[PDB]
Amino acid sequence: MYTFVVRDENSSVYAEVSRLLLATGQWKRLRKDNPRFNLMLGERNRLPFGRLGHEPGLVQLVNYYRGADKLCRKASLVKLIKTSPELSESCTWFPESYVIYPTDEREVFLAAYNRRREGREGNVWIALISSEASELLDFIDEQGQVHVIQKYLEKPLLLEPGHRKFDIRSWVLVDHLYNIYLYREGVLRTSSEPYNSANFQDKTCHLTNHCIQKNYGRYEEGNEMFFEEFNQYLMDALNTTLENSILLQIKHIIRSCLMCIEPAISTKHLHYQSFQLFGFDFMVDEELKVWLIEVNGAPACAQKLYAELCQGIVDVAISSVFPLATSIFIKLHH
Amino acid sequence: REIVHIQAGQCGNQIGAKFWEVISDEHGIDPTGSYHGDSDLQLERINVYYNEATGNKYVPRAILVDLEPGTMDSVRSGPFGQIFRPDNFVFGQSGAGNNWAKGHYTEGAELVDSVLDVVRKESESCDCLQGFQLTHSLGGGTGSGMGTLLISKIREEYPDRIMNTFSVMPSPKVSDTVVEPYNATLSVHQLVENTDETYCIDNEALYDICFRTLKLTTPTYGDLNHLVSATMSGVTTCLRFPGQLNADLRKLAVNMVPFPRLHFFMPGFAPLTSRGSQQYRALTVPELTQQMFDSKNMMAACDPRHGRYLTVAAIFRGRMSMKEVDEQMLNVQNKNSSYFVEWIPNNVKTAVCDIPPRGLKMSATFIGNSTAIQELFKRISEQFTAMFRRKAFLHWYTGEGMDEMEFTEAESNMNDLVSEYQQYQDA
Amino acid sequence: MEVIELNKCTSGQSFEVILKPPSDPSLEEIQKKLEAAEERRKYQEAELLKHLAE
Amino acid sequence: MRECISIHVGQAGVQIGNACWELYCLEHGIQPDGQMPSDKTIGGGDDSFNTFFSETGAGKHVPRAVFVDLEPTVIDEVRTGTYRQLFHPEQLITGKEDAANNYARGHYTIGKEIIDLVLDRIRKLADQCTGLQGFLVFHSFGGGTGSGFTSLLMERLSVDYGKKSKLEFSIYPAPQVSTAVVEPYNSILTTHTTLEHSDCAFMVDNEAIYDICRRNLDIERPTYTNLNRLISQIVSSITASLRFDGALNVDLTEFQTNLVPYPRIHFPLATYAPVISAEKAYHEQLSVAEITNACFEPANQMVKCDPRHGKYMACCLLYRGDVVPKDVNAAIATIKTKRSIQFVDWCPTGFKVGINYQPPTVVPGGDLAKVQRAVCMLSNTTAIAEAWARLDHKFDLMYAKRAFVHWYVGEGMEEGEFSEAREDMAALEKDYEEVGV
Numbered sequence A: 001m002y003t004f005v006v007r008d009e010n011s012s013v014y015a016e017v018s019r020l021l022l023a024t025g026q027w028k029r030l031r032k033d034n035p036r037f038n039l040m041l042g043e044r045n046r047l048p049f050g051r052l053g054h055e056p057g058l059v060q061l062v063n064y065y066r067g068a069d070k071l072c073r074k075a076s077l078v079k080l081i082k083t084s085p086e087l088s089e090s091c092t093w094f095p096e097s098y099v100i101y102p103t104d105e106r107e108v109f110l111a112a113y114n115r116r117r118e119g120r121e122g123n124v125w126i127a128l129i130s131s132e133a134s135e136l137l138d139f140i141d142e143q144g145q146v147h148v149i150q151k152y153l154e155k156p157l158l159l160e161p162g163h164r165k166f167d168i169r170s171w172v173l174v175d176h177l178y179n180i181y182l183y184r185e186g187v188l189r190t191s192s193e194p195y196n197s198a199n200f201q202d203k204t205c206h207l208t209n210h211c212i213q214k215n216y217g218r219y220e221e222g223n224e225m226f227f228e229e230f231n232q233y234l235m236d237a238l239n240t241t242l243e244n245s246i247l248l249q250i251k252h253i254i255r256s257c258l259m260c261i262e263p264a265i266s267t268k269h270l271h272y273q274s275f276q277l278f279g280f281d282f283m284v285d286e287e288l289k290v291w292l293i294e295v296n297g298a299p300a301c302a303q304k305l306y307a308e309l310c311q312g313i314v315d316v317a318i319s320s321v322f323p324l325a326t327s328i329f330i331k332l333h334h
Numbered sequence B: 001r002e003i004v005h006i007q008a009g010q011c012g013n014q015i016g017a018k019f020w021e022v023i024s025d026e027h028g029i030d031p032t033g034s035y036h037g038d039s040d041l042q043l044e045r046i047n048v049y050y051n052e053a054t055g056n057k058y059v060p061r062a063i064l065v066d067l068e069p070g071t072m073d074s075v076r077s078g079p080f081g082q083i084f085r086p087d088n089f090v091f092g093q094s095g096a097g098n099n100w101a102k103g104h105y106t107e108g109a110e111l112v113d114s115v116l117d118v119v120r121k122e123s124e125s126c127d128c129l130q131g132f133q134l135t136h137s138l139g140g141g142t143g144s145g146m147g148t149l150l151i152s153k154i155r156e157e158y159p160d161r162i163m164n165t166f167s168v169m170p171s172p173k174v175s176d177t178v179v180e181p182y183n184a185t186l187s188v189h190q191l192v193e194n195t196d197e198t199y200c201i202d203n204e205a206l207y208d209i210c211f212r213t214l215k216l217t218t219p220t221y222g223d224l225n226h227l228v229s230a231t232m233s234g235v236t237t238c239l240r241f242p243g244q245l246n247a248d249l250r251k252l253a254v255n256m257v258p259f260p261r262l263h264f265f266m267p268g269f270a271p272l273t274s275r276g277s278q279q280y281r282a283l284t285v286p287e288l289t290q291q292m293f294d295s296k297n298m299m300a301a302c303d304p305r306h307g308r309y310l311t312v313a314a315i316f317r318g319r320m321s322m323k324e325v326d327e328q329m330l331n332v333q334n335k336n337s338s339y340f341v342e343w344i345p346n347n348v349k350t351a352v353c354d355i356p357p358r359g360l361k362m363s364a365t366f367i368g369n370s371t372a373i374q375e376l377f378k379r380i381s382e383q384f385t386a387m388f389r390r391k392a393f394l395h396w397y398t399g400e401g402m403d404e405m406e407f408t409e410a411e412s413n414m415n416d417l418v419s420e421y422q423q424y425q426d427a
Numbered sequence C: 001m002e003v004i005e006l007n008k009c010t011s012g013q014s015f016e017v018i019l020k021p022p023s024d025p026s027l028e029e030i031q032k033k034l035e036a037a038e039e040r041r042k043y044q045e046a047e048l049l050k051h052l053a054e
Numbered sequence D: 001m002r003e004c005i006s007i008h009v010g011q012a013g014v015q016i017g018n019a020c021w022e023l024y025c026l027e028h029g030i031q032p033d034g035q036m037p038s039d040k041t042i043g044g045g046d047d048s049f050n051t052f053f054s055e056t057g058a059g060k061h062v063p064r065a066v067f068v069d070l071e072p073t074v075i076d077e078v079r080t081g082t083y084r085q086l087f088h089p090e091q092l093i094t095g096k097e098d099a100a101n102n103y104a105r106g107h108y109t110i111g112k113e114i115i116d117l118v119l120d121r122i123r124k125l126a127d128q129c130t131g132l133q134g135f136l137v138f139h140s141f142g143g144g145t146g147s148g149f150t151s152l153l154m155e156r157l158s159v160d161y162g163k164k165s166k167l168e169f170s171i172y173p174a175p176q177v178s179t180a181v182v183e184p185y186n187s188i189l190t191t192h193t194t195l196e197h198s199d200c201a202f203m204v205d206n207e208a209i210y211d212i213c214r215r216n217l218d219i220e221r222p223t224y225t226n227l228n229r230l231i232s233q234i235v236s237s238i239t240a241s242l243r244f245d246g247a248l249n250v251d252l253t254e255f256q257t258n259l260v261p262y263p264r265i266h267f268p269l270a271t272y273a274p275v276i277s278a279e280k281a282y283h284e285q286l287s288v289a290e291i292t293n294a295c296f297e298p299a300n301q302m303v304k305c306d307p308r309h310g311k312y313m314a315c316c317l318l319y320r321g322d323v324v325p326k327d328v329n330a331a332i333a334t335i336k337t338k339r340s341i342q343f344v345d346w347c348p349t350g351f352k353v354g355i356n357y358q359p360p361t362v363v364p365g366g367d368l369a370k371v372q373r374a375v376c377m378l379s380n381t382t383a384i385a386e387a388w389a390r391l392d393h394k395f396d397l398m399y400a401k402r403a404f405v406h407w408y409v410g411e412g413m414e415e416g417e418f419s420e421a422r423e424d425m426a427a428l429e430k431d432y433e434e435v436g437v
C-alpha cells in the first residue's frame, strides 16, 4: 500500500494521475502536509526539494526535476543554450535570441539588427512582433519584467487548404533513471485564420495558442491536428513522412537539450528521486527545418490524449519505482 | 536515579506485590533478597528500584499502605512477602469502606503523616531521587481517596520530582460497589493536576481480554492481575535495564506529554497469555507489532481508531532482529499515518531489551498517548451523572463532611479533560 | 590551471589552485538573564505551594 | 606554537571526544598512560602536537581538554576507560542530574549551578598556555546539555576570552538515532543563542553518518561507537593541520579566513572519502582522481544535500597519504568539466589544497580498513541550508500547537525566546538564499 500527496490542485494532468492511482486500490492519498509519503505531486513554485528523502523507511519520488527550470524559462533557455558547449553557439535548431532587461546583451542584439538591415534580408523579431527595434525596446521597458527578443521565422510551413500557421507540441517524460521517453502522440496547434505576411499587427494568425484561437474548429476539431492526419498531409502534399521530415529533428533536439542538463539535475545517486513531464514546442519552416521555440515545465495535455498519456506516466515513472502486485513511448537512446 | 514505589489499598497492594514478584525474578532476586542470576545486565540499573544492604542484600524501595491490615497481611505471607522492609508497612485499622471521602479527608488524613515519614526516610537515602510511582485503584476508598491525598502531599514536599501512577479504572463488569464512578471521578480530578504520567489500567479492558481473547469463562482478580503485572514489567523495562537511551521518568514525561494535563496513557501488550498456559511458539516480529497495536491488546477499553496518537513509546523484549523491529514499526506508521498526529514529527520511538520476560521468548509492550482515551473518561462521566442527577448514594460522602459542590467541580474538570482530548483529535 | 603558494615540508605540502577569478552581551547581561529566569521559576513554585496551601 | 583547548559538552560531545583523543594518541604515537617515546624534549617543548597536548616533568602528555556533562554516567566511563590515566580528575566535570532533553533545563536551571566551576577548570588550562588561540567545542543539537549548557558556555567564553576564536563540531539530530521528540526545539534554540559566538561550525548529520556506516561498512545497525569512530576520522582530518607541520589552516583564525567570508554563514560542508570496510576481503585501492571525485557525491557528505543547487564561497581539500599536487590538479581539471560547481561572483573559483604524506590511522579492531590515500573536502556551500529548512519545518509543526512548550516555560524560559530563535533562523535561511540564488 503506497502513499502519495497532491500539492498542485490546478494540474489537469496530475489530477488524472491521482485518480488512476486510487483506482488501483494500492495507492492511498494523504493530506497535503503529511510527510510520510512515497510519491509527491509537487507544487509549481517553491517546491521543497530540501525536505525530500529524509524519511527513514520511505523511498520517496517527486514529479519535478530540481534545476529543470533553467530549461523551461525563456530567459534561462537562451542563456543555457549560449553558454553550454554541447549546444552553443552554432546551434542550428534554435532561433537567434538575446536577453534584454528593462532600464544584459542589448548592444549585442543591435549589432545583429544592423546586418539584417544592412543586408536587406528578413528583419522581423518577437518578444509583440515587429520589424523595428525601437518599437520593441519601448515595449519591454513598459511591461516591467525580463523579456527575450528572438528572430521571427518569416517563412513558416503553411498548411493547405487555408494557408495556415502552426506549432508542434511534443510531450516528453524523463523517469528516475533519466530515460527520455517521447510520447508517440503529438499535436499540431494550428491557426484557423490564414497567415498574413505583411501585417504583423494581427496576432491571431501569427500566434497559435489554443486560447487565442478560441474560424475556430473549421478544418479540424478545436484547432488541433493529430499526427495521423498531419502525416497523411505530408505524404499527399509534399511526398514525405512526419518521421523523416520533422520527427528526426524533434527527437534530436529533445535528446540534446536534456542530455546537456543531465549532470545538473540527475537524481541517480540522490537520497530522493525525480521524474518530470515536459512539453516541447517546435516550429517548422517551409524548408521542413525544425526549430525549438521553448520548453514548458508544467504542460497540459490534449483532451483525447489524457487517458493514454496519464496512464503512461503511471506505468514507467511511478510503477517502475513502486511496483504493483506495446509501449506508447519512444525511448530516445543515449 | 532512584524510584520510590508506593502501593495503596487492596488493589494497589495486590498488583504492587505482583509487580515486585515479577521483576525480582527478572533481576535474579529471590524472596530472601539475595541475588542468584547469571547476567550482569540484571544488576546494572537495579538501584532504580532496590536498596542495597550489607552482605549484598537487595530490598525493594517500596512503601505498602492501607487503612485495613487484611490485604497487607496477605502480602507479608505471600511468596515475596519477606523481601519488603518491615518498617515500610504502614497501616490503619478502620478501613475506608470504598469511600473516597474516608480515604481523602477523615480516615486517611489520620494516617497520611505516618506514610510521609517513611517516604522521607527512603528519599534521604537516595543519591538522586528522580520521582515516585504509585499503584492503586480509583474505584475504592483507600487507593483512590488516600492515594490522591498522598500524591498531593508528596508534591508539596517534593515539587521538583516526577509523580507516576498505575491507576486501575473501575468497571461495572468487575464491580465491588455502585459508588465506584464517584470515587473514580473524584480521583481523576486529582490525577489531572498532580501527576506527570498515569498509566490507565481499565478493568473493563482487562475483563474483556480475559473473556473474549484468553477464553477464560469467569475471570478472577488474579486473572486480571496477570495482565497488569505483564504490562507493568513491560513499561518499566527501559527504566530497569541498560538500553540505548537509559530512560528515566522525567525524560519519558518530556517525550510523551505535549500538554501537561494530557498525560493519561493507554498501555498495550503482546502476546496476550493466561496464567499457567505456556506457549511453545515464539511470535514473529510482524505478529508482535500487529497485535500490540490492536484494540484487543489495549489495557484501556478505548478504540484507538476513534482517535489519534499524540506520542507512542514501544519496547520489544527478547533476542530478535532490531532491524526487523525498526522496519515493522516504521511500516505501521507509514501504513496508518492518519492515526498519528502530523504536527508532532517522529512521535513514535521503539527500544529493544535482550532479556525477555518469564515464560516468553519475546514480547512487546505498548505505551500510547491517544486522544481516544477520552472514551474512558466519558464512560466514567456517564455512570457518574446517572447517579449524581438524583444525588444517589451521596449521603456516604456528605456524612464525612463533603459538599455537593465538590462533586460538581470534579465532574466539570473531567468533562473539560474530555473536551481537551477532543480538541487535538481534530487538529 | 594556476598553482600558487606551493609550500613543502617533510610531512607534506600545501598549495592553492585557481580556475577562474571573481566577477556581544556582557557578564552583567548574562547574569541578568539567568537570574530573571530563576525568578519566574520561583514565582511558579510559589503559586503551586499557595494553591496546595488552599 | 599556539595552544588549542577542546571542550566536550553532553553525551555526544564526550563520547565523540573519546573517539577523537583516542585517534589523536594513535596518530602521534602516544600510549594510554600518556607516554610518548618519540618526543625527545622531555617535560615540554613547542612542537605542533603540543597544540593539543601539554607535558609534565614525568614525560606524560595530557590533552588540553575539558569534559563536562550534567550527568555522571558517561564521563564515569572515561574515568575508568582505557585512557583513564591520560586525563586528570580536574578535566572531567560531572553534575548530579541531566537536562532531560530540555534546552531550558540545561541552559537556565542546571546550567547556572555549574557554569562557574567549568569556567574555573577551563581557566586552569588557559593558564598553562603561552599563546591561546581559542577553543574547539563538541556537542549535540538535540541534547538538553549539548544544546542548553553549550550556548551558555559559548556566551561566557566570548566575555572571558573575547579575542579567542571558537570552533564547533555539532551533531545535527536524526530520527534514526533520536533521543527526544523535542530535538528540533533544542537545535533551533542553541543555534540562535550560539550563532554570534561561533566563528566556524562543522555540522554532522547523524542521518548521513548512520547511512554511510550501513552502506559502506555493511553495519546493519550502527552503534554510537560506529558513528563516532567515523566522525573522529573526519574531525582528525580537519584538525590535522593544527597538530602537524604544514602551511594550510595552521591556526584557528585561518579556518574563518579560508572557509567563512560571511560571519553568519559559517557552516562548512564536510565530505570524506574513501570509507571502506575492514572485513571487506577484496578491495582495489582508489586513486587520487577517484577519491576526489567522491567529494562531490552527496552519499559521502556529513550532511545530505545537493551542492549542485547552491553556490560555493570556499573549498578546501585535505589529503592524507600517497598524494602529490600533480595528480590533484589533474583530478580537479577533469571533475570541473563533468560536475556543476558554481562559486559566488565575489569569490575566486579555486581550491586550497593540503596534503599529509602519512595515511589515515585506523583504530585496531575498528570497522575502517587501512587506505593508501584519503581526502576530506571542506566546502562552504549554500546547499547546507537544506538542513536548516528541514529543521525549521519540524519546529514550525510542533510550535504551531505549542506542543511540549510548557516543559521549557516551566524551567523559567519565556515563550518569546522560541519565536525569537525561530525568527533568527528565518533570517539565516534568507541569508543563504540571497547568496545562493
Ligand SMILES: Nc1nc2c(ncn2[C@@H]2O[C@H](COP(=O)(O)OP(=O)(O)OP(=O)(O)O)[C@@H](O)[C@H]2O)c(=O)[nH]1
Pocket (backbone or CB within 6 Å): D009, D010, D011, D012, D013, D015, D016, D069, D070, D098, D099, D100, D101, D102, D106, D140, D141, D142, D143, D144, D145, D146, D147, D171, D172, D173, D174, D177, D178, D179, D183, D206, D224, D225, D227, D228, D231
Ligand atoms: N554521533 C553521535 N551522536 C550522539 C552520540 N550520543 C548522543 N548523540 C546524539 O545527541 C542527541 C541527544 O543529545 P545527547 O548528547 O545524547 O544528550 P545530552 O547532551 O547529554 O543532554 P541531556 O542528556 O538531555 O542532558 C541525539 O540526537 C543523539 O543521536 C554519540 O555518541 N555519537
Ligand SMILES: Nc1ncnc2c1ncn2[C@@H]1O[C@H](COP(=O)(O)OP(=O)(O)CP(=O)(O)O)[C@@H](O)[C@H]1O
Pocket (backbone or CB within 6 Å): A095, A126, A150, A151, A152, A153, A154, A166, A167, A206, A207, A208, A209, A279, A281, A283, A293, A294, A296
Ligand atoms: N521565433 C518565432 N518565430 C515565429 N513564431 C514564433 C516564434 N516564437 C514564438 N512564435 C509563435 O508564438 C507563439 C507563442 O509563443 P510562446 O511559445 O512564447 O508562448 P507560450 O508560452 O504560451 C507556448 P506554451 O503555451 O506551450 O508555453 C508560438 O506558439 C508560436 O506560434
Ligand SMILES: Nc1nc2c(ncn2[C@@H]2O[C@H](COP(=O)(O)OP(=O)(O)O)[C@@H](O)[C@H]2O)c(=O)[nH]1
Pocket (backbone or CB within 6 Å): B008, B009, B010, B011, B012, B014, B015, B096, B097, B098, B137, B138, B139, B140, B141, B142, B143, B144, B168, B169, B170, B171, B174, B175, B176, B180, B203, B221, B222, B224, B225, B228
Ligand atoms: N485489577 C484489580 N482490581 C481490583 C482488585 N481489587 C479491587 N480492584 C478494583 O478496585 C476497586 C475497589 O478498590 P479497592 O482497592 O478494593 O479499595 P481500597 O482497598 O479501599 O483502596 C474496584 O473497582 C475493583 O475492581 C484486584 O485485585 N485487581
Ligand SMILES: O=C1NC(=O)[C@@H](c2cn3c4c(cccc24)CCC3)[C@@H]1c1c[nH]c2ccccc12
Pocket (backbone or CB within 6 Å): B234, B235, B236, B237, B238, B239, B243, B245, B246, B247, B248, B251, B252, B253, B255, B256, B311, B312, B313, B314, B315, B346, B347, B348, B349, B350, B351, B367, D178, D179, D180, D181
Ligand atoms: O527510552 C526511551 N526514553 C524516552 O524518553 C522514550 C521516548 C518516548 N517517545 C520518544 C520520542 C523520541 C525519543 C525518545 C522517546 C518520540 C515520542 C515518545 C523511549 C522509550 C521507547 N520505548 C519505551 C518504553 C518504556 C519507556 C521508555 C521508552
Ligand SMILES: [Ca+2]
Pocket (backbone or CB within 6 Å): D039, D040, D041, D042, D043, D044, D045, D046, D047, D055
Ligand atoms: Ca616535547
Ligand SMILES: [Mg+2]
Pocket (backbone or CB within 6 Å): B010, B011, B140, B176
Ligand atoms: Mg476492595
Ligand SMILES: [Mg+2]
Pocket (backbone or CB within 6 Å): D010, D011, D069, D071, D098, D099, D143, D145
Ligand atoms: Mg545526557
